[PDB]
Design a protein around this ligand. Structure first.
Ligand code: HEM
Ligand code: HEM
Ligand SMILES: CNCc1cccc(OCc2ccc3ccc(N)nc3c2)c1
Ligand SMILES: CNCc1cccc(OCc2ccc3ccc(N)nc3c2)c1
Ligand SMILES: C[C@H](O)[C@H](O)[C@H]1CNc2nc(N)[nH]c(=O)c2N1
Ligand SMILES: C[C@H](O)[C@H](O)[C@H]1CNc2nc(N)[nH]c(=O)c2N1
Ligand SMILES: [Zn+2]
Lengths: 406, 404
């Protein structure tokens, strides 16, 4: 009936319509001729800045129920004046907080959005050096880790400025394991991290040689070479992996870090671009257990675990990969619980997401979601989100990919 | 322009140029992607263009493009359409058309097999009784005592101002779903509606969990007729587990032949409303979807209790552990019964080889990532890490409304 996408849940038979998608002011990669929804990474003039700024200020005043008021029209005139004399403008602190949270809420690929209202926003817009960035980051890590009782947080560094260089954190995460290319062609540690490891070495880092060496931070303040900073070990909480019934699993010496803190994304609010704005939550167990440890192009431990479980690895039909993978995931969950470090399994996460979808249906008339990323990498059809159709679209404020600084 | 397509495990890049041959719209627009939706929301010059395109594909396929036979066949089609508003395919064109529709099916992980398809021409069918004979022969051929062979039977095309030939069942073999008035369903909940239609058309119902349904067959503008399949034609595999001796005690079983019968086959603008086709099962369809889906037989909790797993909490991954044992039971049992089946690992591996064949052959291959990636162990298969482009090519299989 209504002129909006109809959206079905096939488990429950329930129907909704997404009206929120009509607020998208930015095109995705799909056309009526072909769907490109499965691609990971598909491919200012003051007039364009102003329309984005106005849109965000409207968003802000709506959220505090003062839409159309005197303070709304004054903030609008102030932003236009600011832009008129300087080419850019600045956010009030409470505007920054609302934007950072709206950006997380708007992120289609995040299954953890039930939590979006509980985000601690650290304003670091006064930072003027790389040393100072290191201080802010350390504080963030400390606050976010909270000795294993993890708290969502984001630290926002100064925005892109006309005729000045960007604040950048070169590492893709605040905590990452080194990946050392060996003379045979293979990689010790995390192959995902080969490039960043070699950049750290060029910049003067004395390299380790373990499978789990924590990388130093490479931090770049405006118009300056990046500087190297070693994280003090006591700040970086790690969890050794053991299995509840398989006693040998502990002998593998596997481990992972507690804090998933992404640091290379661009946070865009009202046309303003924050090139350095690391944020962190807590892991879903399949991220560590299935992706980081079992991806063929990552740690690739599946065959090793399977051999220890004495499975038949000469034939697909023994389901040795599925069997090993479940035990690895169980080890991740059990170890994190034993260490009292916050973690969530893929069943509890997806159930909480279904609740999130129901909330946003009422609050906003929809919720942008990327099915391929929301559905977990193991046990897909055993979670409720698998049977839930989703509509994917770009809303702003937004977290965005950005080119590597080198 | 043309999509850049990357495999994230191997770092290799292709470009899809096949998609430029798509002439029919999908559901997506640049404002929003609707790729996860299961079903679509909803003259003579048009028929002539689709007809001309298909004939061109056919003569190109046999390397005789431009031949005298080619030019004449285009005039034949043009003469039939100008005179009658429609036209008919020759058997060879139909055989080609059916294979191309399979080859073009973006949701099918089994397309490495696309050239090996037996095509039965049932276009000289005039009654429901005749459709039944054709269907029984199809099942007999396809089943082949456990050595499954892909096949399709094609019934008369749709015609203006006449009802359609239809098989009302979604698959030729399906288990009944009886709704007990205390809410629950005995049997397959996916089939409650078809089960009820059968009963009021005069079927005496059973009361088991695996009662094979009769077929409702409809000749144009006639009420459908009921036909019970000869029990010897329906091959079933009882499920047991290689190590859990209690598993056989569950009484689980499934049929060998996945034979879809409600899709529409479109070739060169002609529409075949009844064109059932079958191949063989991939184990996850039975183990994960049919037996473990919450809105199907939903046996996860039962198997979990038998394995003495901690059902109290999600963090024990009881669901994942039971699911794996069920899929293992399916593989073991089909293999023990000498019935064709492929596991999701072998299947996705063969699909990758297919993407590669098709890249060289046609410059791309339409694929629906959400459907190609198996319902358990997604990222442990190569297809997970492969980007895919989805679009509609003709000839094609399409959904069509339920005839009731
Ligand atoms: C609090 C617990 C959280 C959980 C369990 C969670 C879970 C996830 C997961 C599993 C993914 C998929 C990423 C992958 O597979 O590599 C993801 C993506 C994402 N998350 Fe969340 N998240 C959480 C908190 C946050 C926070 C605090 C933010 C930002 C303020 C955030 C923003 C994002 C963004 C932008 C993506 C997409 C990244 C990309 O496109 O590459 N998440 N999240
Ligand atoms: C020979 C072995 C075959 C295998 C292993 C196979 C595998 C599969 C699987 C796993 C699906 C997903 C279906 C679901 O989840 O319900 C599928 C879908 C599909 N298959 Fe195949 N298939 C085979 C043969 C065939 C043949 C012979 C045809 C037609 C000539 C065909 C046409 C299709 C079509 C049109 C779909 C999409 C159905 C829909 O959208 O509902 N397949 N296939
Ligand atoms: C390989 N895909 C791109 C890529 C590269 C590096 C990290 C990353 O992770 C995304 C991401 C972002 C935020 C997250 C928040 C919480 C969490 N558990 N995982 C999260 C994962 C994604
Ligand atoms: C969109 N409705 C989903 C739906 C409803 C009814 C049957 C069905 O089966 C799809 C299907 C089609 C062809 C197949 C060929 C081989 C095979 N193993 N499974 C196959 C599965 C799928
Ligand atoms: C090709 C495909 O898009 C790619 O492998 C995606 C699929 N789904 C994903 N889902 C999550 N959560 N994270 C990922 O990196 C990916 N990768
Ligand atoms: C909502 C979602 O698109 C829907 O559940 C799809 C997902 N992928 C699937 N994949 C296959 N093979 N079969 C299916 O029925 C589905 N269902
Ligand atoms: Zn799309």
């Amino acid at each position: 009936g209504p002129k909006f996408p109809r959206v079905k849940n096939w488990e429950l038979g329930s129907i909704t319509y997404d009206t929120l998608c009509a607020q998208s002011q930015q095109d995705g990669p799909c056309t009526p001729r072909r769907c490109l929804g499965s691609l990971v990474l598909p491919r200012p003039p003051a007039e364009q800045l102003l329309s984005q700024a106005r849109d965000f200020i409207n968003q802000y005043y709506s959220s505090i129920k003062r839409s159309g008021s005197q303070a709304h029209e004054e903030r609008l005139q102030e932003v236009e004046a600011e832009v008129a004399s300087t080419g850019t403008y600045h956010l009030r602190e409470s505007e920054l907080v609302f934007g950072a949270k709206q950006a997380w809420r708007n992120a289609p690929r995040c299954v953890g959005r039930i939590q979006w209202g509980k985000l601690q926003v650290f304003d670091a817009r006064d930072c003027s050096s790389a040393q100072e960035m290191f201080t802010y980051i350390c504080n963030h890590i400390k606050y976010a880790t909270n000795r294993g009782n993890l708290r969502s947080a984001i630290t926002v560094f100064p925005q892109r400025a006309p005729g000045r260089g960007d604040f950048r954190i070169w590492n893709s995460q605040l905590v990452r394991y080194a990946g050392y290319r060996q003379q045979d062609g293979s990689v010790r540690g995390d192959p995902a991290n080969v490039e960043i490891t070699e950049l750290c070495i060029q910049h003067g880092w004395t390299p380790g040689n373990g499978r789990f060496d924590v990388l130093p931070l490479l931090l770049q303040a405006p118009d300056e070479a990046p500087e190297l900073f070693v994280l003090p070990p006591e700040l970086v909480l790690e969890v050794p992996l053991e299995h509840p019934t398989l006693e040998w699993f502990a002998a593998l010496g596997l481990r992972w870090y507690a804090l998933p803190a992404v640091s290379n994304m661009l946070l865009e609010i009202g046309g303003l671009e924050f090139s350095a704005a690391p944020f962190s939550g807590w892991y879903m167990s399949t991220e560590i257990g299935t992706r980081n440890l079992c991806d063929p192009h990552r740690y690739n431990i599946l065959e090793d675990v399977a051999v220890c479980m004495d499975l038949d690895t000469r034939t697909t039909s023994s389901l040795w990969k599925d069997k090993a993978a479940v035990e690895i995931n169980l080890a991740v969950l059990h170890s994190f619980q034993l260490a009292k470090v916050t973690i969530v399994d893929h069943h509890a996460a997806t159930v909480s997401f279904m609740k999130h979808l129901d909330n946003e249906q009422k609050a906003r008339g929809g919720c942008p979601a990327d099915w391929a990323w929301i559905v977990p990498p193991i046990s897909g059809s055993l979670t409720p989100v698998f049977h839930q159709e989703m509509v994917n679209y770009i809303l702003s404020p937004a977290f965005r990919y950005q080119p590597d600084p080198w």
